Each structure stands twice: as structure tokens, then as C-alpha cells.
Amino acid sequence: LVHVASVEKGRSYEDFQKVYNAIALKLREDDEYENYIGYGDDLVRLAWHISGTWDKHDNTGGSYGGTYRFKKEFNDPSNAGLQNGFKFLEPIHKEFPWISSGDLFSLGGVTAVQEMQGPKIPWRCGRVDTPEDTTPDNGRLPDADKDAGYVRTFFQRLNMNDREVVALMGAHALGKTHLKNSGYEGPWGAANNVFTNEFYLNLLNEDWKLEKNDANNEQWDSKSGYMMLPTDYSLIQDPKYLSIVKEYANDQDKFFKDFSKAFEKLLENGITFPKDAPSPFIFKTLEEQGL
Numbered sequence: 578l579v580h581v582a583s584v585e586k587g588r589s590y591e592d593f594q595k596v597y598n599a600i601a602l603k604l605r606e607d608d609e610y611e612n613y614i615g616y617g618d619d620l621v622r623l624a625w626h627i628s629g630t631w632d633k634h635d636n637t638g639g640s641y642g643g644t645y646r647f648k649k650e651f652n653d654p655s656n657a658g659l660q661n662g663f664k665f666l667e668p669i670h671k672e673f674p675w676i677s678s679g680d681l682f683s684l685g686g687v688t689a690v691q692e693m694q695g696p697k698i699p700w701r702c703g704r705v706d707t708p709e710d711t712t713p714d715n716g717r718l719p720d721a722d723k724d725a726g727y728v729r730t731f732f733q734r735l736n737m738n739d740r741e742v743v744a745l746m747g748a749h750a751l752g753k754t755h756l757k758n759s760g761y762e763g764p765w766g767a768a769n770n771v772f773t774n775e776f777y778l779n780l781l782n783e784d785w786k787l788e789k790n791d792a793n794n795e796q797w798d799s800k801s802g803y804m805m806l807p808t809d810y811s812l813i814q815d816p817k818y819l820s821i822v823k824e825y826a827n828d829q830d831k832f833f834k835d836f837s838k839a840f841e842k843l844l845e846n847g848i849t850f851p852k853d854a855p856s857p858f859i860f861k862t863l864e865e866q867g868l
């Protein structure tokens with residue numbers, strides 16, 4: 578099963594930067610730190626969840642086909658809340674009907690991360706929408722009520738190693754859990770629509786208590802009002818994860834660089850890029866463009 582990246586006919590950097598900017602401008606328009614719904618946060622979680630269905634074994638799932646547009650995946654319990662990101666992106670897809678769904682969904686997360694001051698994420702176009710029957714079944718996304726071994730094992734299926742896992746998880750610094758979406762409640766940190774290594778710092782420096790939330794699910798709660806999923810807290814239970822947690826907590830740049838590579842890899846798993854495909858695009862943020 579091979580998915581060859583196919584550049585949207587005639588498109589190039591400028592086109593995607595335009596899509597970037599439309600998303601970025603609407604994020605500025607639609608997001609406020611205080612809001613219940615974090616569109617920017619939904620966009621990077623959506624980019625992850627469209628990719629995280631991937632199975633290296635047979636190349637099913639993955640961001641290529643844009644199958645989140647399909648009911649089965651759209652209604653994945655694991656994707657609860659993401660509909661806001663979809664709805665956010667619809668006017669953008671309408672303005673740019675030529676971009677594929679996969680590219681738009683993935684570009685949304687890239688755009689959201691960059692606009693929330695995260696690292697630059699190189700991004701490659703060429704995802705092609707695939708038919709509804711290529712939609713991956715539900716259940717491929719990870720459970721939050723698990724330990725380090727689960728996590729490590731889970732991400733092996735996504736071809737991610739310990740460093741990649743720990744880096745990727747740092748995106749939880751963005752936003753929070755919403756009890757009605759996931760059975761968890763509370764911010765991981767400064768849920769202020771800012772991408773930072775706060776996730777790691779909180780893990781190491783907060784006073785965590787294993788409690789049960791209003792949904793009868795256990796999560797780690799801090800006096801500061803932060804929370805960690807058991808899977809997040811896994812990263813400091815496991816000694817291998819722990820050393821990388823500490824590295825990222827002590828090196829914002831390193832975290833940014835590693836997150837950047839892992840996110841792009843995540844978003845590109847399952848996709849074959851012909852030797853003559855365009856180079857990855859690095860989009861300018863609104864502020865870099867003075868927009």
C-alpha cells in the first residue's frame with residue numbers, strides 16, 4: 578500500500594503560504610486564551626489524530642487520505658471536540674478548494690503550532706484524498722489511562738522512538754482536557770495558546786497527586802491547578818522517558834527542534850515523496866510577514 582505525494586496541480590510555496598495565512602488570520606480571529614474551545618489547539622490535535630491512525634505495518638490510516646472528513650473517523654470517540662477544528666477549516670477549504678483534505682488538516686496543525694510561537698515545522702504537500710472505504714476503523718488512537726509501556730508500544734506502530742514520543746507529548750502544553758470530550762479535565766499548564774516546553778517543567782516541578790476527576794477517571798493533579806494524563810505522567814515514571822523529559826525541560830530550543838522533526842514525521846508517515854517532489858515548505862508566520 579503506497580501513497581505517493583501528488584502536488585496539487587501547479588501549486589507551490591506561495592499557494593500554501595496563502596492557505597497558512599488564511600488559517601493563521603482566522604486563528605487570530607477565532608482564538609482567545611480564555612475560550613473553552615481552543616481552535617489552534619484543535620488544529621494541532623487534529624493534525625496529530627489524522628496522522629496517529631497510521632499503522633506502519635500495512636500503511637493503513639495516516640494523514641495522506643484525509644479520511645477524517647468521513648463519518649467513521651469524524652465520529653471517532655478519540656476525535657471528540659475536533660469537529661470544531663473541522664468547522665474552523667471549512668471556510669478555509671472553501672476559499673482554497675484545491676488543497677487536499679490531508680494537506681489542509683495537516684497544514685492546520687503546522688500553522689497553529691507556528692502561530693502559537695512554537696517551532697517552525699517544515700511541511701510537505703501532496704496528500705491526496707482517498708475514498709471513504711480507506712477510512713481507518715476507530716481505536717487506533719491512544720488511550721490516556723495507560724502506562725509507559727503502553728505508550729512506548731503504542732508509538733512503535735507509528736514508528737516513533739522514545740525521544741520522538743516524549744517530544745510529541747510536549748504539545749500538551751497547549752490547551753487542556755475537556756471532561757465532555759475525553760473523560761479528563763484541566764489544563765496541562767498555561768493553557769494560553771502558547772507553544773512552550775511547559776509540559777516538561779510542570780511534570781518535573783509540580784506537586785502531582787493521583788486523583789479521580791468528575792468522570793471517575795484517574796489523572797494527576799497539581800496544586801497549581803494543572804493536570805497530567807496517566808500517559809503523560811508515564812513519561813516521568815519510566816526512567817528512559819524521564820531522562821528525555823528532563824532534557825526538554827532544560828532546553829527549550831532542543832525541545833523545539835525535536836518536536837519539529839517528530840511532528841513533521843508524524844504528519845508525513847505513510848507518505849511516499851517522489852525524488853522530484855518539492856522540498857518541504859517552511860511557512861512564515863503572520864508576525865514574520867507583518868500581517
Ligand code: HEM
Pocket residue numbers: 615618619621622625657658719720721722728745746748749751752753754755756757758759760761806808840
Ligand atoms: C499517548 C498519547 C496521547 C494521548 C493519550 C493523548 C490524549 C489527549 C487527551 C485525552 C486530550 C483532551 C481532548 C479533549 O478533552 O479535548 C488531549 C488533547 C490534546 N492533545 Fe493529546 N494525547 C496524546 C498525544 C498527543 C500528541 C502526540 C499530540 C500532538 C503532537 C497531542 C496534542 C494534543 C493537543 C494539542 C491537545 C489539547 C487540545 C485542547 O486544548 O483542545 N496529543 N490529548
Ligand SMILES: [Mn+2]
Pocket residue numbers: 613614615616618619658752
Ligand atoms: Mn480545544
